[PDB]
Amino acid sequence: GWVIGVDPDIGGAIAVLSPDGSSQVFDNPFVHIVVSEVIRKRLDTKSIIQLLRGLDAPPGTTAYIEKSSPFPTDGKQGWWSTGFSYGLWIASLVASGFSVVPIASQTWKAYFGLMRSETPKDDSRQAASILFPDKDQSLKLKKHAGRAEALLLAAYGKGLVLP
Amino acid sequence: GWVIGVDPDIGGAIAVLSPDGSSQVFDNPFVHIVVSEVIRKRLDTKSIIQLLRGLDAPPGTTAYIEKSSPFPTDGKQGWWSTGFSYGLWIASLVASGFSVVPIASQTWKAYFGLMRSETPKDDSRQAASILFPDKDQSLKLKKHAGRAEALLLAAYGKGLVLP
DNA sequence: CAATCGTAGGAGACCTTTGGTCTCCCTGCAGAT
DNA sequence: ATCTGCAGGGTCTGGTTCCAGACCTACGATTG
Ligand SMILES: [Mg+2]
Ligand SMILES: [Mg+2]
Protein backbone atom coordinates (compact mmCIF):
# COMPACT_ATOMS: atom_id res chain seq x y z
CA GLY A 1 0.00 0.00 0.00
CA TRP A 2 2.57 2.59 -1.08
CA VAL A 3 1.49 5.71 -2.97
CA ILE A 4 3.50 8.61 -4.41
CA GLY A 5 2.14 12.08 -5.22
CA VAL A 6 4.08 14.61 -7.30
CA ASP A 7 3.55 18.36 -7.74
CA PRO A 8 6.08 18.72 -10.59
CA ASP A 9 6.55 22.47 -10.86
CA ILE A 10 9.42 24.57 -9.49
CA GLY A 11 7.83 25.17 -6.07
CA GLY A 12 6.40 21.66 -6.09
CA ALA A 13 7.12 18.60 -3.97
CA ILE A 14 6.96 14.82 -3.87
CA ALA A 15 4.91 13.01 -1.20
CA VAL A 16 5.31 9.35 -0.27
CA LEU A 17 2.65 7.46 1.71
CA SER A 18 3.58 4.18 3.40
CA PRO A 19 1.33 1.17 4.21
CA ASP A 20 1.62 1.89 7.94
CA GLY A 21 0.07 5.34 7.46
CA SER A 22 3.26 7.35 7.73
CA SER A 23 4.05 10.05 5.20
CA GLN A 24 7.07 11.92 3.88
CA VAL A 25 7.12 15.07 1.77
CA PHE A 26 10.15 16.57 0.00
CA ASP A 27 10.48 19.98 -1.67
CA ASN A 28 11.44 19.68 -5.33
CA PRO A 29 15.22 20.09 -5.70
CA PHE A 30 16.19 23.01 -7.89
CA VAL A 31 19.26 24.90 -9.06
CA HIS A 32 19.84 28.42 -10.33
CA ILE A 33 20.67 28.56 -14.07
CA VAL A 34 21.83 31.38 -16.35
CA VAL A 35 19.50 31.87 -19.34
CA SER A 36 19.56 34.97 -21.61
CA GLU A 37 21.88 36.72 -19.11
CA VAL A 38 19.39 36.37 -16.22
CA ILE A 39 19.04 33.76 -13.47
CA ARG A 40 16.24 31.20 -13.55
CA LYS A 41 15.29 28.43 -11.16
CA ARG A 42 15.16 24.98 -12.72
CA LEU A 43 14.50 21.54 -11.29
CA ASP A 44 17.65 19.64 -10.34
CA THR A 45 17.55 16.44 -12.42
CA LYS A 46 20.29 14.50 -10.65
CA SER A 47 18.98 15.34 -7.16
CA ILE A 48 15.49 14.23 -8.18
CA ILE A 49 16.80 10.90 -9.48
CA GLN A 50 18.93 10.41 -6.35
CA LEU A 51 15.91 11.29 -4.20
CA LEU A 52 13.75 8.71 -5.97
CA ARG A 53 16.42 6.03 -5.70
CA GLY A 54 16.58 6.48 -1.92
CA LEU A 55 12.83 6.06 -1.43
CA ASP A 56 11.66 2.92 0.33
CA ALA A 57 8.59 2.70 -1.93
CA PRO A 58 9.08 -0.43 -4.07
CA PRO A 59 9.11 -0.75 -7.87
CA GLY A 60 5.59 -0.71 -9.26
CA THR A 61 4.37 1.84 -6.71
CA THR A 62 2.02 4.28 -8.41
CA ALA A 63 3.05 7.92 -8.71
CA TYR A 64 0.14 10.34 -9.15
CA ILE A 65 1.47 13.45 -10.90
CA GLU A 66 -0.46 16.61 -11.61
CA LYS A 67 -1.12 17.05 -15.33
CA SER A 68 0.51 19.99 -17.08
CA SER A 69 -2.13 22.30 -18.52
CA PRO A 70 -1.07 25.96 -18.69
CA PHE A 71 -3.54 28.73 -19.63
CA PRO A 72 -3.53 30.13 -23.20
CA THR A 73 -2.79 33.55 -21.67
CA ASP A 74 0.30 32.30 -19.83
CA GLY A 75 3.53 33.27 -21.57
CA LYS A 76 5.52 30.96 -23.81
CA GLN A 77 8.20 30.59 -21.09
CA GLY A 78 5.49 29.32 -18.75
CA TRP A 79 4.49 26.74 -21.36
CA TRP A 80 8.09 25.57 -21.90
CA SER A 81 8.70 25.30 -18.15
CA THR A 82 5.58 23.29 -17.30
CA GLY A 83 6.39 20.98 -20.22
CA PHE A 84 10.02 20.67 -19.12
CA SER A 85 9.20 20.02 -15.44
CA TYR A 86 6.56 17.45 -16.43
CA GLY A 87 8.83 15.56 -18.83
CA LEU A 88 11.76 15.50 -16.39
CA TRP A 89 9.56 14.21 -13.56
CA ILE A 90 7.84 11.55 -15.68
CA ALA A 91 11.13 10.21 -17.03
CA SER A 92 12.69 10.18 -13.54
CA LEU A 93 9.70 8.32 -12.09
CA VAL A 94 9.61 5.74 -14.89
CA ALA A 95 13.37 5.23 -14.74
CA SER A 96 13.09 4.67 -10.96
CA GLY A 97 10.54 1.89 -11.46
CA PHE A 98 7.34 3.73 -10.57
CA SER A 99 4.04 3.60 -12.47
CA VAL A 100 3.02 7.13 -13.47
CA VAL A 101 -0.62 8.26 -13.46
CA PRO A 102 -1.35 11.86 -14.53
CA ILE A 103 -4.16 13.57 -12.59
CA ALA A 104 -5.93 16.77 -13.57
CA SER A 105 -6.12 19.33 -10.78
CA GLN A 106 -9.89 19.40 -11.32
CA THR A 107 -9.95 15.72 -10.34
CA TRP A 108 -8.33 15.91 -6.92
CA LYS A 109 -9.79 19.35 -6.19
CA ALA A 110 -13.33 18.07 -6.77
CA TYR A 111 -12.53 14.90 -4.83
CA PHE A 112 -11.66 16.93 -1.72
CA GLY A 113 -14.33 19.60 -2.33
CA LEU A 114 -11.83 22.38 -3.05
CA MET A 115 -13.15 23.75 -6.38
CA ARG A 116 -14.13 27.43 -6.76
CA SER A 117 -12.26 28.47 -3.63
CA GLU A 118 -11.47 32.10 -2.84
CA THR A 119 -8.14 30.91 -1.35
CA PRO A 120 -7.23 27.70 -3.20
CA LYS A 121 -3.66 27.39 -1.95
CA ASP A 122 -4.58 28.10 1.67
CA ASP A 123 -7.41 25.57 1.44
CA SER A 124 -5.01 22.94 0.08
CA ARG A 125 -2.67 23.39 3.04
CA GLN A 126 -5.63 23.14 5.42
CA ALA A 127 -6.94 19.96 3.79
CA ALA A 128 -3.46 18.38 3.72
CA SER A 129 -2.85 19.18 7.38
CA ILE A 130 -6.18 17.57 8.32
CA LEU A 131 -5.36 14.42 6.35
CA PHE A 132 -1.73 14.34 7.57
CA PRO A 133 -1.69 16.02 11.00
CA ASP A 134 1.95 15.03 11.55
CA LYS A 135 2.74 17.36 8.61
CA ASP A 136 0.92 20.35 10.18
CA GLN A 137 4.18 22.13 11.08
CA SER A 138 5.49 21.55 7.53
CA LEU A 139 2.40 23.23 6.06
CA LYS A 140 2.14 26.51 8.00
CA LEU A 141 3.79 28.75 5.38
CA LYS A 142 2.17 29.99 2.16
CA LYS A 143 5.21 28.69 0.28
CA HIS A 144 4.31 25.17 1.57
CA ALA A 145 1.38 24.87 -0.85
CA GLY A 146 3.41 22.61 -3.14
CA ARG A 147 3.94 20.24 -0.22
CA ALA A 148 0.17 20.24 0.31
CA GLU A 149 -0.64 19.52 -3.34
CA ALA A 150 1.76 16.58 -3.43
CA LEU A 151 0.22 15.17 -0.25
CA LEU A 152 -3.29 15.63 -1.60
CA LEU A 153 -2.38 13.90 -4.87
CA ALA A 154 -1.07 10.93 -2.90
CA ALA A 155 -4.14 11.00 -0.63
CA TYR A 156 -6.36 11.01 -3.73
CA GLY A 157 -4.51 8.02 -5.13
CA LYS A 158 -4.78 6.20 -1.81
CA GLY A 159 -8.49 6.98 -1.51
CA LEU A 160 -8.24 8.89 1.77
CA VAL A 161 -11.26 10.93 2.94
CA LEU A 162 -11.57 14.12 4.97
CA PRO A 163 -13.46 13.81 8.33
CA GLY B 1 35.78 6.16 -26.88
CA TRP B 2 31.99 6.08 -26.70
CA VAL B 3 29.85 9.10 -27.60
CA ILE B 4 26.07 9.61 -27.69
CA GLY B 5 24.22 12.26 -29.69
CA VAL B 6 20.58 13.14 -29.14
CA ASP B 7 18.19 15.11 -31.31
CA PRO B 8 15.40 15.22 -28.69
CA ASP B 9 12.37 16.37 -30.67
CA ILE B 10 9.53 14.17 -31.91
CA GLY B 11 11.13 13.35 -35.26
CA GLY B 12 14.58 13.23 -33.69
CA ALA B 13 16.94 10.37 -32.98
CA ILE B 14 19.71 9.02 -30.76
CA ALA B 15 23.09 8.14 -32.29
CA VAL B 16 25.67 6.00 -30.49
CA LEU B 17 29.32 5.91 -31.61
CA SER B 18 31.60 3.00 -30.48
CA PRO B 19 35.38 3.09 -29.97
CA ASP B 20 35.87 0.76 -32.96
CA GLY B 21 34.25 3.36 -35.25
CA SER B 22 30.88 1.66 -35.65
CA SER B 23 27.68 3.64 -35.24
CA GLN B 24 24.01 3.07 -34.47
CA VAL B 25 21.12 5.48 -34.82
CA PHE B 26 17.56 4.97 -33.54
CA ASP B 27 14.49 7.06 -34.32
CA ASN B 28 13.01 8.56 -31.16
CA PRO B 29 10.23 6.27 -29.87
CA PHE B 30 6.82 7.88 -29.84
CA VAL B 31 3.14 7.16 -29.23
CA HIS B 32 -0.08 8.81 -30.39
CA ILE B 33 -2.16 10.40 -27.62
CA VAL B 34 -5.44 12.31 -27.49
CA VAL B 35 -5.12 15.96 -26.45
CA SER B 36 -8.02 18.45 -26.71
CA GLU B 37 -9.95 15.98 -28.93
CA VAL B 38 -7.13 15.60 -31.50
CA ILE B 39 -4.23 13.18 -31.86
CA ARG B 40 -0.70 14.27 -30.91
CA LYS B 41 2.64 12.52 -31.25
CA ARG B 42 4.54 12.38 -27.97
CA LEU B 43 7.84 10.74 -27.10
CA ASP B 44 7.57 7.27 -25.55
CA THR B 45 9.19 7.61 -22.11
CA LYS B 46 9.32 3.90 -21.28
CA SER B 47 10.68 2.96 -24.69
CA ILE B 48 13.40 5.61 -24.40
CA ILE B 49 14.57 4.32 -21.02
CA GLN B 50 14.62 0.73 -22.30
CA LEU B 51 16.61 1.82 -25.37
CA LEU B 52 19.17 3.61 -23.19
CA ARG B 53 19.44 0.65 -20.81
CA GLY B 54 20.21 -1.59 -23.78
CA LEU B 55 23.19 0.41 -25.03
CA ASP B 56 26.70 -1.00 -24.60
CA ALA B 57 27.97 2.53 -23.93
CA PRO B 58 29.30 2.40 -20.33
CA PRO B 59 28.26 4.69 -17.45
CA GLY B 60 29.76 8.15 -17.71
CA THR B 61 29.61 8.26 -21.52
CA THR B 62 28.84 11.79 -22.64
CA ALA B 63 25.47 12.41 -24.30
CA TYR B 64 25.57 15.55 -26.45
CA ILE B 65 22.00 16.85 -26.70
CA GLU B 66 20.75 19.74 -28.82
CA LYS B 67 19.71 22.62 -26.56
CA SER B 68 16.05 23.61 -26.68
CA SER B 69 15.72 27.16 -28.04
CA PRO B 70 12.30 27.76 -29.64
CA PHE B 71 11.73 31.00 -31.52
CA PRO B 72 9.62 33.74 -29.88
CA THR B 73 7.39 33.48 -32.99
CA ASP B 74 6.67 29.77 -32.48
CA GLY B 75 3.41 28.86 -30.79
CA LYS B 76 3.13 28.16 -27.09
CA GLN B 77 2.48 24.48 -27.95
CA GLY B 78 5.86 24.39 -29.66
CA TRP B 79 7.43 25.86 -26.53
CA TRP B 80 5.72 23.28 -24.28
CA SER B 81 6.72 20.40 -26.57
CA THR B 82 10.39 21.37 -26.89
CA GLY B 83 10.55 21.77 -23.11
CA PHE B 84 8.76 18.46 -22.51
CA SER B 85 10.95 16.57 -24.99
CA TYR B 86 14.12 18.15 -23.56
CA GLY B 87 13.21 17.39 -19.94
CA LEU B 88 12.19 13.81 -20.74
CA TRP B 89 15.47 13.10 -22.54
CA ILE B 90 17.75 14.79 -19.98
CA ALA B 91 16.22 12.85 -17.09
CA SER B 92 16.29 9.57 -19.03
CA LEU B 93 19.96 10.08 -19.91
CA VAL B 94 20.91 11.08 -16.34
CA ALA B 95 19.04 8.14 -14.84
CA SER B 96 20.76 5.75 -17.25
CA GLY B 97 24.22 6.86 -16.10
CA PHE B 98 25.22 9.19 -18.94
CA SER B 99 26.86 12.63 -18.66
CA VAL B 100 24.61 15.17 -20.43
CA VAL B 101 26.17 18.04 -22.40
CA PRO B 102 23.71 20.44 -24.10
CA ILE B 103 25.01 21.87 -27.42
CA ALA B 104 23.51 24.76 -29.38
CA SER B 105 22.57 23.99 -32.97
CA GLN B 106 24.78 26.92 -33.99
CA THR B 107 27.78 25.18 -32.41
CA TRP B 108 27.72 21.92 -34.38
CA LYS B 109 26.47 23.63 -37.55
CA ALA B 110 29.43 26.02 -37.51
CA TYR B 111 31.84 23.18 -36.70
CA PHE B 112 30.73 21.35 -39.88
CA GLY B 113 30.38 24.49 -42.03
CA LEU B 114 26.60 24.14 -42.34
CA MET B 115 25.61 27.65 -41.24
CA ARG B 116 23.51 29.77 -43.61
CA SER B 117 22.32 26.91 -45.82
CA GLU B 118 19.16 27.31 -47.87
CA THR B 119 18.62 23.53 -47.52
CA PRO B 120 19.88 22.86 -43.98
CA LYS B 121 18.19 19.49 -43.49
CA ASP B 122 19.35 18.15 -46.86
CA ASP B 123 22.86 19.37 -46.06
CA SER B 124 22.77 17.69 -42.65
CA ARG B 125 21.86 14.40 -44.27
CA GLN B 126 24.67 14.82 -46.80
CA ALA B 127 27.23 15.59 -44.08
CA ALA B 128 26.15 12.62 -41.93
CA SER B 129 26.34 10.34 -44.97
CA ILE B 130 29.95 11.36 -45.60
CA LEU B 131 30.96 10.93 -41.96
CA PHE B 132 29.06 7.63 -41.53
CA PRO B 133 28.89 5.99 -44.97
CA ASP B 134 27.39 2.77 -43.59
CA LYS B 135 24.36 4.90 -42.63
CA ASP B 136 23.96 6.21 -46.20
CA GLN B 137 20.98 3.91 -46.77
CA SER B 138 19.36 5.17 -43.55
CA LEU B 139 19.65 8.84 -44.58
CA LYS B 140 18.06 8.81 -48.06
CA LEU B 141 14.71 10.34 -47.03
CA LYS B 142 13.74 13.86 -46.02
CA LYS B 143 12.28 12.52 -42.74
CA HIS B 144 15.73 11.05 -41.90
CA ALA B 145 17.13 14.48 -41.05
CA GLY B 146 16.61 13.73 -37.36
CA ARG B 147 18.88 10.69 -37.67
CA ALA B 148 21.36 12.97 -39.46
CA GLU B 149 21.38 15.58 -36.71
CA ALA B 150 21.85 13.00 -33.94
CA LEU B 151 24.84 11.56 -35.80
CA LEU B 152 26.33 15.02 -36.37
CA LEU B 153 25.94 15.86 -32.68
CA ALA B 154 27.77 12.65 -31.78
CA ALA B 155 30.43 13.32 -34.45
CA TYR B 156 30.90 16.80 -33.02
CA GLY B 157 31.40 15.32 -29.56
CA LYS B 158 33.92 12.81 -30.90
CA GLY B 159 35.88 15.42 -32.89
CA LEU B 160 35.34 13.90 -36.32
CA VAL B 161 36.11 15.98 -39.42
CA LEU B 162 34.69 15.94 -42.91
CA PRO B 163 37.24 14.92 -45.59
C1' DC C 1 13.30 35.09 4.35
C1' DA C 2 8.64 35.04 2.98
C1' DA C 3 4.89 37.18 0.71
C1' DT C 4 2.61 39.87 -2.84
C1' DC C 5 1.81 41.83 -7.42
C1' DG C 6 0.96 41.92 -12.41
C1' DT C 7 1.83 40.42 -17.04
C1' DA C 8 2.66 36.50 -19.98
C1' DG C 9 8.15 37.42 -21.74
C1' DG C 10 14.05 33.97 -26.68
C1' DA C 11 18.39 32.27 -26.57
C1' DG C 12 22.93 31.39 -28.03
C1' DA C 13 27.94 31.76 -29.92
C1' DC C 14 31.60 34.27 -31.17
C1' DC C 15 33.29 38.84 -32.77
C1' DT C 16 32.96 43.55 -33.65
C1' DT C 17 35.16 41.84 -28.06
C1' DT C 18 33.18 45.10 -21.19
C1' DG C 19 28.19 45.66 -25.71
C1' DG C 20 27.38 44.17 -30.65
C1' DT C 21 25.86 41.13 -34.26
C1' DC C 22 24.38 37.41 -36.33
C1' DT C 23 22.73 32.81 -35.89
C1' DC C 24 19.30 28.91 -34.85
C1' DC C 25 14.99 25.92 -34.44
C1' DC C 26 10.48 23.53 -33.36
C1' DT C 27 4.92 22.20 -33.37
C1' DG C 28 0.46 21.45 -35.33
C1' DC C 29 -2.42 20.64 -38.85
C1' DA C 30 -4.10 20.77 -43.64
C1' DG C 31 -2.94 19.58 -48.45
C1' DA C 32 -1.07 17.02 -52.32
C1' DT C 33 0.71 12.80 -55.00
C1' DA D 1 3.77 6.77 -47.05
C1' DT D 2 6.30 10.79 -47.69
C1' DC D 3 6.48 15.67 -48.48
C1' DT D 4 5.00 20.23 -48.58
C1' DG D 5 3.07 24.74 -46.85
C1' DC D 6 2.45 27.72 -43.35
C1' DA D 7 1.12 29.81 -39.16
C1' DG D 8 2.19 29.77 -34.22
C1' DG D 9 -2.47 27.35 -31.80
C1' DG D 10 -5.46 25.14 -24.18
C1' DT D 11 -7.00 21.48 -21.85
C1' DC D 12 -9.57 18.90 -18.73
C1' DT D 13 -13.80 16.32 -16.43
C1' DG D 14 -18.37 15.37 -15.86
C1' DG D 15 -22.05 15.37 -18.81
C1' DT D 16 -22.89 13.09 -23.34
C1' DT D 17 -22.69 12.85 -29.23
C1' DC D 18 -20.93 19.10 -27.91
C1' DC D 19 -21.75 21.33 -23.74
C1' DA D 20 -20.53 23.75 -19.50
C1' DG D 21 -17.63 24.72 -16.20
C1' DA D 22 -13.35 24.07 -14.06
C1' DC D 23 -8.00 24.53 -13.60
C1' DC D 24 -3.16 26.66 -13.35
C1' DT D 25 1.93 28.05 -14.07
C1' DA D 26 6.39 31.38 -14.96
C1' DC D 27 9.06 35.51 -14.64
C1' DG D 28 10.51 39.70 -12.46
C1' DA D 29 9.78 42.83 -9.45
C1' DT D 30 8.86 45.12 -4.81
C1' DT D 31 7.32 45.03 0.18
C1' DG D 32 8.31 44.12 5.27
MG1 LIG E 1 0.52 22.41 -9.68
MG1 LIG F 1 16.52 19.68 -33.24
H/E series of chain A: EEEEEHEHEHHH
Give the fraction of residues assigned to helices of chain A. Answer: 25-40%
Largest sheet: spatial strand order of chain A: 3-2-1-6-7
Which molecules are bound in this entry?
Answer: magnesium ion
The value of Rg of chain A in angstroms is 15 Å
Strand content of chain A: 15-25%
Count of helical regions of chain A: 5
How many distinct folded domains of chain A? 1
Largest interface, counted by CB within 8 Å of the partner chain's CB:
A-B, 29 and 28 residues
C-alpha end-to-end distance of chain A: 21 Å
The oligomeric state is homodimer
GO molecular function (chains A, B): crossover junction DNA endonuclease activity; metal ion binding
Keywords (chains A, B): Calcium, Metal-binding
Binding site for Mn(2+) 1 (chains A, B): 7, 9, 66, 149
Binding site for Ca(2+) (chains A, B): 7, 9, 66, 149
3D architecture notes:
- Chains A, B: Mn(2+) 2 binds at residue 145.
- Chains A, B: Keywords: Calcium, Metal-binding.
- Chains A, B: Ca(2+) binds at residues 7, 9, 66, 149.
- Chains A, B: Mg(2+) 1 binds at residues 7, 9, 66, 149.
- Two copies of one chain form a homodimer.
- By secondary structure, chain A is an alpha/beta fold.
- The first copy, chain A, has one domain.
- Chain A contains five helices and seven strands.
- The first copy, chain A, has helices spanning 45-53, 76-95, 105-111, 120-131, 145-158; strands at residues 3-7, 13-17, 23-27, 30-35, 38-43, 62-66, 99-103.
- The longest helix of chain A is centred in the middle third of the chain and has 20 residues, at 76-95.
- The radius of gyration of chain A is 15 Å and the shape is globular.
- The interface between A and B is medium-sized, with 29 and 28 residues.
- The structure holds magnesium ion (2 copies).
- The site of one magnesium ion has 5 residues of chain B, from loops.
- The structure holds a DNA duplex (33 and 32 nucleotides).
